[PDB]
Amino acid sequence: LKPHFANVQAHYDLSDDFFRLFLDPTQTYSCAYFERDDMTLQEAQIAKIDLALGKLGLQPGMTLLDVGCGWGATMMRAVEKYDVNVVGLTLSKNQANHVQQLVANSENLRSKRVLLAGWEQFDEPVDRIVSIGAFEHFGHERYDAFFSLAHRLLPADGVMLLHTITGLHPKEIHERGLPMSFTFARFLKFIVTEIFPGGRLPSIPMVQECASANGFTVTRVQSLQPHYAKTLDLWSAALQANKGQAIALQSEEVYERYMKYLTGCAEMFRIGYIDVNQFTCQK
Ligand SMILES: CCCCCCCCCC[N+](C)(C)CCCCCCCCCC
């Protein structure tokens, strides 16, 4: 199984400078958690991180594996607030380099590693696992392999917090009393073709199946559905105000595409065609 470096890199290696125009300072690129009403995006992203890490029963000395570490905000938070060693995986060249600098400049004593590789090329024992918004890039065809590896790399009391967007079947969506449909399907095509090449959304039962079939017990499924529309609204508001900057670094063609993507997804979550859930997978 050769990781899909090309497709994944197609999106995230666009330009850190560009993503910085709409993501919060920690560069977290996933659904935030507005635990409190007046939280800033940065505070809500940290709260999301704590929500995920707080389910792992972390302890000093442990080694945490972050599958699809992104720009590393989660890894560094794990080190700094929870005092654990970390290992981060990503197919993005720019992310690997960025996190490599965070590691190089850290004054914390814990072990920190970032690899430009996929879980498909990682076979090392870890104490706990966290994966936020990376699953959507694996593809239905590799779900079983992922959980197999996850279960194999974890200790006896191991735990994996899998956070991923989930979707309903377009055919069955019509019964949910949800109009549009065609519009939804047409937008999904747009996303997979111009935003996330190779992307694929898993249904909740699909995650529950691959987990159980590989020896895991899903002890909790928490939805952050409403929180994503706001996260996306905040991302789009910033990008738009940074429009002039967006075109300079790239092109107005890229800008238009990203605004269409950010805003569109926001409505999709608002109406309920898509969801986002954190699965506590207990070994
Ligand atoms: C139906 C095809 C779905 C492909 C989904 C690809 C998802 C990539 C998610 C990447 N992160 C975690 C960085 C988040 C980006 C913002 C939310 C995007 C939601 C897309 C929903 C498409 C239905």
Q: Rounded to an integer, what distance in angstroms lies between the CA atom of residue 30 and that of residue 45?
A: 8
**248 CA from centroid of ligand 1 (Å):** 25
Closest CA to 197 of 257, 154, 240, 116: 257
Torsion of CA 120, 123, 129, 131, to 10 degrees: -10
Beta-bridge partner residues of 160:
129, 281
* Residues framing ligand 1 (Cβ under 6 A): 29-30, 133, 136, 165, 167, 188, 191-192, 196, 199-201, 265, 274
CA–CA distance, 239 with 245 (Å, rounded to integer): 9
Residue 95 labeled ligand binder: yes
User: Of the candidates 171, 129, 133, 173, which has an alpha carbon nearest to the alpha carbon of residue 149?
Assistant: 129
Supply the DSSP string of 150-191, one letter for each residue. Answer: HHHHS-TT-EEEEEEEEE--HHHHGGGT---THHHHHHHHHI
Of 161, 152, 153, 132, the C-alpha closest to 54 is 161
In the reported structure, the alpha carbon of residue 163 is separated from the centroid of ligand 1 by a whole-number distance in angstroms of: 12
Length of the chain in terms of residues written: 283
CB 130 within 8 Å of CB 74: yes
Q: What's the rounded Cα separation, in Å, for the pair 79 and 58? A: 11
**Three-state DSSP class for 97?**
helix
Catalytic residue, chosen from 31, 210, 265, 281, is 265
- The span from the CA of 45 to the CA of 24, in Å, is 8
Token pair 């694996």 is at which residue?
A: 138
Cβ neighbours of residue 39 closer than 8 Å, sequence gap 6 or more:
47
CA–CA distance, 261 with 272 (Å, rounded to integer): 16
Annotated ligand binding at 223? The verdict is: no
Q: Which two tokens stand for residue 7?
A: 């497709």
Judge whether 235 is annotated as a binding position. no
* Residues 28, 31: Cα–Cα separation, whole Å: 9
Closest CA to 64 of 148, 153, 141: 153
**Cα–Cα distances in Å, from 256 out to 30, 135, 252?**
21, 26, 6
Specify the DSSP class assigned to residue 194: I
Residues 83 and 56 sit within 8 Å (Cβ to Cβ): no
| Residue 84, token pair as written in the block | 């654990």
Residue nearest to atom 23 of ligand 1 (CA): 188
User: How is residue 132 written in tokens?
Assistant: 């936020």
And the tokens for 48?
């999301």
Protein residue whose Cα sits closest to atom 21 of ligand 1: 265
Closest Cα to atom 14, ligand 1: which residue? 30
Q: How many CB atoms lie within 10 A of CB 133?
A: 16
Q: How far is CA 124 from the centre of its chain?
A: 21
**Cα gap 118→257, rounded to integer Å:** 27
Ligand 1 centroid to Cα of residue 136, in Å, is 7
Alpha carbon distance 157, 283 (integer Å):
6
For the chain, how long is the longest CA-to-CA vector?
55
Exposed (0-12), middle (13-18) or buried (19+): which is 253, by Cβ within 10 Å? exposed
Q: How many CB atoms are closer than 10 A to CB 109?
A: 9
Closest residue by Cα to residue 132 from 84, 71, 62 = 71
Is residue 219 left, alpha or beta, with left meaning phi > 0 and alpha meaning psi from -120 to 50? alpha
CB 190 within 8 A of CB 260: yes
And the tokens for 264?
């569109």
- Angstrom distance (rounded) from CA 107 to CA 18: 28
17 is in an annotated binding site: no
Closest alpha carbon to 30 in 236, 276, 279: 276
Q: What angle do CA 283, 55, 12 make, to 5 degrees?
A: 95
Residue with the smallest CA separation from ligand 1 atom 6 is 199
Domain ranges of the chain: 1-283
Looking at the DSSP bridge assignments, the partners of residue 85 are 63
Nearest to 196 by CA among 240, 142, 136: 136
Active site residue 31: no
Strand-pair partners of 282? 159, 217
Query: For domain 1-283, is the CATH number 3.40.50.150?
Result: yes
CB 165 within 8 A of CB 101: no
CA 264 – CA 202 distance, rounded (Å):
19
CB-based contact 158:143 (threshold 8 Å): no
Task: Give me the DSSP letters along 25-89.
Answer: TT---S----SSTT--HHHHHHHHHHHHHTTTT--TT-EEEEET-TTSHHHHHHHHHH--EEEEE
**Tokens found for residue 231:** 């996260």
How were these coordinates obtained? X-ray
